[model samples]
Target: AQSVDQLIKARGKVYFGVATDQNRLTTGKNAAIIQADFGMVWPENSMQWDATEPSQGNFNFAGADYLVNWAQQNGKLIGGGCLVWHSQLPSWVSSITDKNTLTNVMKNHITTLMTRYKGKIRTWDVVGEAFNEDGSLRQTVFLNVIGEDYIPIAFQTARAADPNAKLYIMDYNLDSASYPKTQAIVNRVKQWRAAGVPIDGIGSQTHLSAGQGAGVLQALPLLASAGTPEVSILMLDVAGASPTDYVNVVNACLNVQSCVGITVMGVADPDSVRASTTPLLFDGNFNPKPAYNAIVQDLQQ
Candidate 1:
């Protein structure tokens, strides 16, 4: 029922997805979007540790696993990340100040999940938001326990578990050119990699509050240079309403050769679904939006 009729699939013209833990493949109409022409998939916080492991020693695989499995079945390239959100911290896990215990728990969790979904999942946000804008590790349960070394450990552990997966360090506010912390992360990532740490890519989670363009672009070159001569994948994209402004940002990503793809969240405002939503190719009655024509129009270009 969902279709990709209005979308385009070029080598670099990637269609992005917006997903939820409780929704179906069709609920977001992501299945239809991907079915239409998109090549890449971005599942939100569902895959975070909190979502998967709500209990201390108990790991729940039902929700996240189902999403990954759906992506694989649909032939879409999946970018898996549910490990970084702090909400996943269970009381027992969160109460402990011991860094070793946190590291051991996360290491085991990453190993278990990544290995279970290895070939099916091609990319992963192994560690998300490990550092503050100041380049210091955020005072997160993981950082407070494992200290700053958790970044490399996360990537290394993930790589060791699923050696072929493209690993990423994802975070928001990193896109701002003026954000000191963003630049700090750039520098820190360099410090880790130069030390022979196996970090493979950076995930720029852009949740912009309008403006602030310079902050986002500031680290692009630095990131690219980090993977220089070897070719690194730059994912300069984000999600929200998928408005024209959002698409404009994505179109910009297309121009940067290093930026191989863009993933857009297909969610339109539910309340004003008929009024303010983009030219949705589909509608609330499970119908399509008029703006969907605009999407098709852009794809044609």
Candidate 2:
């Protein structure tokens, strides 16, 4: 029997990865299917700021190391998800009102994470979800202190630490071809590239409801035109999607040469971050859903 990872690898361009939690990494049927199906791993929670550094000037990698070690041992590529983001931030870091100190803290976090997992993590979401729905930068601690410059600062820091890694800025709602947020992201990337920020790719979260696949098919190529050769389906939550929607969404990534990979949030629906929804390719029992088979077929095509 062939697997999804094998089929995706056969394509030779895009990779199929999953954003999985630590609890499901080592045991149960989830592990069995995860090991067989995905080519890459996104530590959905472990690498987030709060998980790795819960205090000021102190660090912890117990969670990240577990996920990274597991991914490496299984021959899976790891994503250094979200070196800078507004959510899940601890009080110490968020409470900083000084720009100079916050900038230093941000740089330290990026350097520490990227340096430690230099060769292991293939991509890093250096900055994650900083824009508002209307295309302006959202207000976060990073922004409140450092303003818009925080994004470039974060990207530049990741580049210096891991020159070989693909550094990305990820956001939600960018898979639409005409969303203002998408263009806003494009504009920023071009400016950063022009200034030699070493910014690389855009990681569109692609969180969608049903019947929204056509948007991604139209959106990714547009994102690719911004600056880099590496746009990605960073993570997806098709909690309410149909099998046809699944095929179309995967096709969205497949149709774009610059789109390098795809990531579903988790292996099973019950573990999905969303509430009361079956948004994943596997059901609660770890059996492959129709969405999974649909992707296998779509990928083969």
Candidate 3:
């Protein structure tokens, strides 16, 4: 039984990870397959705002802890997802009108989560989906109340909390149309580095569908040119497409030196965010699909 993790590890350049909800990770055959096959784990929801800090000043690490602990125990790297995001936020955070209070809240959340899970987490999606398609800031609760300072502040606070962890500002649809969103993110990262902020890397939630490979190829150079040391196609979706299409997407990342990894949105179809869509490497019966064989075959080649 050849493991995807072992093959990617043999490459000595890339990581093969999977994203799954806590429910699948904690019990049943799904956990067994994940533990055996992947090199990294991205908890789909455990580390988010609502899950971690459902109320002001009170933290819940139960779900997140289970995943982190499992990853550490199994020698798998954990990508601590999404410290700050507009979605999945608790009501207290979304309703804040005071600037100072909101800033403190953001810092505290970053520090608390990062510091506690410091060395254990390999990377953090420090800020998730902060930009619009037109290269402008998306007006979120943070932007509307705390202004633009929230971006660097979040990164700075995470750095302070866990100096060893790789921090990323993540976004979706970056590879689409004119590369405006991708360039915007790259520009922000350059700005952060210029300001002496301890920011690192970028996560492209590619979420690709059919006919998007050209955009991804076009966008990769822009990201690499902007000094992005590490990159991951965080959520990949080429459902209903041929295995060759999947191979092409994986090849796009492999050809780039800085694009360090790829994580399929789900390992199996039933394990997917929307199970009916069948957007993964394994079918509903937990049997390896053509996409799985395609990745394995190419990596072996």
Candidate 4:
């Protein structure tokens, strides 16, 4: 459920997307978002291994399927989730502790999911979180299980499943100047393209911290060099209690062509949930704190 009407009324399009680590669209805050009519984009639920094929040799697609069906029924666009989080796979597959096997599993899972949703899913986060603060592989569980080749393997799987799918590699903290994670991910994606991997796009989850506009702006070139697919920024969980920094960051994204769109977070603590409860624009029954005003101003600008 997304507030598609409001989005359509305003921007002539919707940036309504819900992200989940667990029980996203089915429960808690995201479930309410599902009730809205905006377009849908799966964040972690459909992508992470823990939620998809938690058990070895067993793939559970229930949680993700719910959101997919929800989007289809509501006539909303859908994007596949984080295709690179290795943390969610069950202890068994995760425990495989073999890099090759890990990559193999990732390849299989991505291929299976994309194949199933080939025509329905227009975008896919082919890879997610493969970089360190300096943009190097973090040596995480997936890296430990699958080694350096996992990145290429992920894109290949997506391409094999859906040749026309809009593939993207999503990551956080990449836009932070202090943290070169964003640059690092871009470099890696460039390498994949150089190697002839089928990558369609790059996604910077503008989960931006305040005062980081320049940092994100600086990242534009790096992101642009990844491939032919320009760039898309999914602005989620973007709120500062006070609102000063948030305003600047939102403006930066709005002005950037690389930043195709943004999805402002609806829930805010103390200000909205606890302070006062009301349904206003860009809010989820939460009171509009100062940050709401900042977002409103950004839109006006």
Model 1 error, position 99 (Å): 3.1
CA displacement after TM-score superposition, residue 195 of candidate 2 (Å): 1.5
Ranking by lDDT: 2, 3, 4, 1
TM-scores, each model vs. reference: 0.78, 0.96, 0.95, 0.77
Identify the leading candidate in terms of lDDT: 2
Clashing pairs in 2: 239-279
- Per-residue lDDT tens digits for candidate 1, residues 173-206, read 6665556766677677778888877777776665
Off by over 4 Å in 4: 1-16, 20-37, 43-47, 97-100, 225-228, 239-244, 264-284, 287-290
Residue-wise C-alpha lDDT for candidate 2, range 1-301, written one tens digit per residue: 3477778778865578888767887655766787888888888788889988888768889888988888888888888778898888988998899999999999998899898888778998888888898988899999989988888788778888988999988899997878899888888788889988877888888878888877787888888889686888867878574788788877777778787878887788887778476888888877888888888887788
Cand. 4 TM to true fold: 0.77
Error of 4 at 134 (Å): 2.6
Q: How well does model 1 score by local distance difference test? A: 0.58
Best by TM-score: 2
Please list the residue runs of candidate 3 whose C-alpha ends up more than 4 Å from where it truly belongs after superposition: none
lDDT of 4 at 168: 81
Q: Candidate 2 — number of clashing residue pairs?
A: 1
The deviation in Å at residue 84 for candidate 2 is 0.6
The candidates, ranked best first by TM-score, are 2, 3, 1, 4
Kindly report which residue stretches of model 2 are placed more than 4 angstroms away from their true locations once superposed.
none
